[PDB]
Design a protein around this ligand. Structure first.
Ligand SMILES: COc1cc(-c2cncc(-c3ccc(C4CCN(C)CC4)cc3)c2C)cc(OC)c1OC
Ligand SMILES: COc1cc(-c2cncc(-c3ccc(C4CCN(C)CC4)cc3)c2C)cc(OC)c1OC
Ligand SMILES: COc1cc(-c2cncc(-c3ccc(C4CCN(C)CC4)cc3)c2C)cc(OC)c1OC
Ligand SMILES: COc1cc(-c2cncc(-c3ccc(C4CCN(C)CC4)cc3)c2C)cc(OC)c1OC
Lengths: 292, 283
């Protein structure tokens, strides 16, 4: 049974649109891509061809379609539906306790380590657009990573690097220093993993702000909210990250809580200007497994 | 809104290493569904990437409808959905059907038209495209007497080709792989072989040749790469032109055209546009 009913639009933007739909009497998410982003549709389809990509902390794929009549093309991605929405949405209007905060960030680390580590199969995969809008919240309190349209793949056994053909760049707010100054080593797989680690540190910060300690919590803010304009440009971000050497500020109330003190240390080890100094996804996962 | 995606698979019309092709039904309309083997996933990816780049629409190109990827328990299912041509492939059609001058020219001019449309870069448009596996099994016959070219799984924009149809520069590995015109010239060679296959089935003075594939008299079934290289490259053989063609003005013109698709020197071969013009001036 292949038919789908589109029920409500849950998101519209430059990307296209996402719909809540019904398939075999279950909710599914249906992304209809803008023609401006056709290369993301194709790349995401190449990524989801891999059966061993499937993981509790990666958005689950159902189908991909390109349809056309005459000069009109539609591009469809059908996935699992997570009615709690993105982590960005969720953090707006919920605070976290220690257990929920660590469950969320460990789940994202688990997904990211699963992407980064090759299975001998699933290639090693770097995401390149990790951010809180690209993470969905699940009813079990874990998250899953979404949007593989910019991903890079690498196979150690065959010495193959597949950077794809997509002139899309990452979300400007979350771009690492080497992306903003354009010195990133483009033929080095490890360079792309290190860009994900930078962005992961920013997502850690966004989440940890929302964890209560000693009756105090910060309001939700996106990374660099205090130092760049609304709707920051590439150059706006380059100014603060590369010229001003800014990193998100650690609220001093974190240092009274052992969990938030450990998390502050971890996010600082994602933010070194030297990409090779940054922690690996596996190391972040192991550290978060040990933190309580 | 309801998005009807069910396709009823009715009849298998082809099965090989590539996978299978089915006649199917969508919303009361015949469609063709190619189900890819795991062996041939890259052909689905290449054709899909091409149609994501340029939505080709031409009467002599098999009409695209959809590329479908579906997650299964243990595998990925890849379908290509196209227009359905109930008369089947040119290879199939030539087995029992004979042709007259009008029907022979209409078939070969339609193929040349499709091939020139692939080859030409159009600005503001489409990239230039080489097919890389042109043969009579990759051409479908329409009810209006024209054909269309199918299978862009090996196509290149600006798996190896079927060995029987490989040009000499492919067999001797001299092809200039960094020159896009090289790939057009490989398609022209293959076109010339298809033109020979069709012309044999055109009746003149009560005579027709039986259907045979190119080089049937000099290589085995499923000829090896070496088998082909020795015939095409070392001995420089070309398909036989029967004497009876030289009594018929159409087959005389078609023999000359074939000759100028089969030059050893790829740059000496006719272009698809020049073949069209020559075909329009026959009869
Ligand atoms: C994939 O294939 C087939 C698809 C369809 C089909 C079904 N619903 C809607 C549509 C459609 C409507 C409207 C637009 C445009 C109109 C102008 N502007 C506003 C942009 C949008 C595009 C598309 C189609 C084409 C029918 C088919 O057959 C009759 C197909 O062929 C098998
Ligand atoms: C990031 O990327 C993709 C995401 C999804 C996806 C999957 N489940 C649920 C959602 C969702 C549902 C609901 C809300 C909100 C909307 C309004 N308010 C805030 C309450 C509810 C937000 C989000 C989405 C967006 C699907 C995709 O593809 C099909 C994605 O692309 C890969
Ligand atoms: C996803 O998968 C398949 C889909 C279809 C199919 C079925 N009904 C309707 C459609 C349709 C077309 C176009 C629009 C347009 C309307 C104009 N608007 C401004 C933008 C969107 C909406 C809907 C499609 C594409 C057929 C399939 O097989 C033949 C599919 O599977 C490959
Ligand atoms: C070359 O390649 C592709 C071909 C096709 C395709 C399209 N229409 C019709 C056909 C077909 C139908 C019917 C017969 C037979 C059956 C009944 N009769 C008694 C004899 C004739 C043969 C052939 C095909 C095989 C689709 C493809 O993709 C979906 C192809 O791949 C690109």
């Amino acid at each position: 049974a292949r038919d789908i009913t589109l029920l409500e639009c849950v998101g519209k933007g430059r990307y296209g649109e996402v719909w809540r739909g019904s398939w075999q009497g279950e909710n599914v998410a249906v992304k209809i891509f803008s023609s401006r982003d056709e290369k993301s549709w194709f790349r995401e389809t190449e990524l989801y061809n891999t059966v061993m990509l499937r993981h509790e902390n990666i958005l689950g794929f159902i189908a991909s379609d390109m349809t056309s009549r005459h000069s009109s093309t539609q591009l469809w991605l059908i996935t699992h539906y997570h009615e709690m929405g993105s982590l960005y949405d969720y953090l707006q209007l919920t605070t976290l306790d220690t257990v929920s905060c660590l469950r969320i960030v460990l789940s994202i680390a688990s997904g990211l380590a699963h992407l980064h580590i090759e299975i001998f199969g699933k290639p090693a995969i770097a995401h390149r657009d990790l951010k809180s809008k690209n993470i969905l919240v699940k009813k079990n309190g874990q998250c899953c990573i979404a949007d593989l349209g910019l991903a890079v793949m690498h196979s150690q056994s065959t010495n193959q690097l597949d950077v794809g053909n997509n002139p899309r760049v990452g979300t400007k707010r979350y771009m690492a220093p080497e992306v903003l100054d354009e010195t990133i080593q483009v033929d080095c797989f490890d360079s792309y993993k290190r860009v994900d680690i930078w962005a992961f540190g920013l997502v850690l910060w966004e989440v940890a702000r929302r964890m209560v300690s000693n009756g105090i919590v910060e309001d939700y803010k996106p990374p660099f909210y205090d130092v760049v304009p609304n709707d920051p440009s590439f150059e706006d971000m380059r100014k603060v990250v590369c010229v001003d050497q800014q990193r998100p500020n650690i609220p001093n109330r974190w240092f009274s809580d052992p969990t938030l003190t450990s998390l502050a240390k971890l996010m600082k080890e994602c933010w070194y200007q030297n990409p090779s100094a940054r922690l690996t996804a596996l190391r972040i996962k192991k550290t978060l497994t040990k933190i309580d």
